[PDB]
Ligand binder design. Structure first.
Ligand SMILES: [Ca+2]
Ligand SMILES: [Ca+2]
Ligand SMILES: [Ca+2]
Ligand SMILES: [Ca+2]
Ligand SMILES: [Mn+2]
Ligand SMILES: [Mn+2]
Ligand SMILES: [Mn+2]
Ligand SMILES: [Mn+2]
Lengths: 235, 235, 235, 235
């Protein structure tokens, strides 16, 4: 199966797989059962921003999520990603719905990785502030589409703009990303994305994640709903 | 056949296909017969740097090449690249040898493209200061290799470091690049590369080019030597 | 007197100093009498974006201005800025009102300059997306203030948000900028700013400019109104 | 007195002020007595590179120093810089000599700071790869000079290139830097510098530091030698 490191914006509390009893941000290392969570005061129908940062010296994966006019939520976990992920990865966004539903709309996405050797810099940077119908530098999986209102819709939305249940979709950047190299003295990455989660319901589900995977990662069988398009089971 | 826009560092004067009688830098629009050239005081065995710049407002493709302690050469050509190239391209480096030969060593390569809409920025940036044996974000073609002394060797070099004749090789960045979009008010790109051209001979050949192509571009049949791995003939 | 190169967003047609009979974008080289203009379909009360680009190889100063959902305006002028400006400059935003008035609100401002030598890069980059009451890396002149609603108000606005007539203000980045150096083979810069020009009147005035000056530039005596805080007279 | 946070490359072991018995890298928070050190296998006459990173989420100041063909040294310290430094700072390089001496030559220096609000980015970036005789965007203090061989010489060097004892010099970037803002959800910075420490002696002294200070910081009285141009005493 795939190797997954993700930051989840988990909109629906599944208390039998260890979610707390509230919407939360979480760090997921090879399991949907977050190694660390924080309470997230999710706002239905508001555009929010998530930031993810890591470096190989500190070996600490950190995330912050906010909305305009509101306090942030943050979570951190000590993990050496060179012990979890392979040397070459792909980076992506995932989202799902289940019997409860929401839009999983991405308005922008940026990513920077840097490898500094002892010679000196290798870097990759992309920024999307709008998505075209045919966005050739993204690999879309499952129900993900680009170009509606210039956005990335990770899960299915109707003609009328209503979100659909039982949906899963992902978008990965086309180029592999180099996160370890034998002469690297510092490796770092940052990601940002802006999202709009809207639901007609009092109980939206299931969430959006930023993830890093093996380069050939695909949507696991039956990873709708609580598994966020990332994991085949709740182990 | 492929669509090619390139900047050539042409080490060998082929006067029957319009080269001037000296090493030169040139702008190549769909032909090895440069639309514009300038004299280049090429230095055998010295590391040099080339810079390429363009934007959609000015519609002028410009290049500068230099060595430390020496004067630069520069060439410019007015061309609307949205009339020559498709909306999605790949970017790359090419080099060849013929019956005359040289190393076509790349020590670093960087590229930045920006699309500014009326909404606002879409960007791609990569930087390579060293190349690994298995450089998964490059597409190598022909004789190109990575990882010898951490460099990109575009054409064949022997165990002893001697350049081989009748060689052609290219490297393209893995992700397609978006150089036109319908809401773009400004599109721009810049490229830089550092190169080491060495020959045991008084007459090195054939040269290195930075190029932009259709995304599915491949080395044309019989494009060794004067055709620089870019063109199928000298039309 | 100061040396000024500017891009003007000129909201009020002063036909006796050569303005065309409509709001316009213009390139100003040492004179309020633009060397080049283009028609600008200015939108009272809409946030717009201006982009300015130049490089020393092409020697062409270009600008684009747009609003969301609208066509752009663009202007270009061939000028070697190394023949007009000194080696060290400051960069800034200016605005004025006269007997006719408008807000001259800046919501964001970014600037990048690069000097590439034959050795290789020297760079400066700043980005402001919000302005604090005490913004220590800006030099405010005249009526300019920071921190109201997190914006830069270049000209006077009342408690109620009404723009005031006979006002002039500028903001310059604190650090001098190096735009020529003797070993530079390419020098370039880009600027972006987002602005909100609002007036209760059918005839707003006078405009906003992005400018480059001698480092010790100050507001000329009596440069309210048609002189945009840039020039002492209409020569 | 000034407020100082620094990363020291300490070439001379002063064991009575807590230095270990070897050249070392250290994190200095308001004291020359490092809060944390690591062994540094300093190489007389070799160009080396230092990297410094921090962010407000992790609150961990980390540094790495290396030379080509050698293993790195690294040091980290948990510190909330918003509790140590004011909201506006200057950033700089310092160096000293005493009765033992060395060159304190800077070949390049780069710095990036980012403030991400809940609205979204404020950024400053500079890069120097060469220094001119009159480098107007640096504040030079004490014996520091620019433009000899295009380098920054932090301490005195003779006509012949011999380093002088009893010397102290600093260079600060001209613009103040904003490292805390009330709406910032993430603040980060990175610095890089390349240095050449050369001595005719078996015992070079005293070292180079990257530092962050109050904006009006100056060289303390009698801060030659072991105090690195940073501190007035060894408290
Ligand atoms: Ca859940
Ligand atoms: Ca030729
Ligand atoms: Ca006017
Ligand atoms: Ca010491
Ligand atoms: Mn969860
Ligand atoms: Mn030619
Ligand atoms: Mn005008
Ligand atoms: Mn020490």
């Amino acid at each position: 199966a795939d190797t997954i490191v993700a930051v989840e914006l988990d909109t629906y509390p599944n208390t039998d797989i260890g979610d707390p009893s509230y919407p939360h941000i979480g760090i997921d290392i090879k399991s949907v059962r977050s190694k660390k969570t924080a309470k997230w005061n999710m706002q239905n129908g508001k555009v929010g921003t998530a930031h993810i940062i890591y470096n190989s010296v500190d070996k600490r994966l950190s995330a912050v999520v906010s909305y305009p006019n509101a306090d942030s939520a943050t979570v951190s976990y000590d993990v050496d990603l060179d012990n979890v992920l392979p040397e070459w990865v792909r980076v992506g966004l995932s989202a799902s719905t289940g019997l409860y539903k929401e839009t999983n709309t991405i308005l922008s996405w940026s990513f920077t990785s840097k490898l500094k050797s002892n010679s000196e810099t290798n870097a990759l940077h992309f920024m999307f502030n709008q998505f075209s119908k045919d966005q050739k530098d993204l690999i879309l999986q499952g129900d993900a589409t680009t170009g509606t209102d210039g956005n990335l819709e990770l899960t299915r939305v109707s003609s009328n703009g209503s979100p659909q249940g039982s949906s899963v979709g992902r978008a990965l950047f086309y180029a592999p990303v180099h996160i370890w190299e034998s002469s690297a003295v510092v490796a770092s990455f940052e990601a940002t994305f802006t999202f709009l989660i809207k639901s007609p319901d009092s109980h939206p589900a299931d969430g959006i994640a930023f993830f890093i995977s093996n380069i050939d990662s695909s949507i696991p069988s039956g990873s709708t709903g609580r598994l966020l398009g990332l994991f085949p089971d709740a182990n």
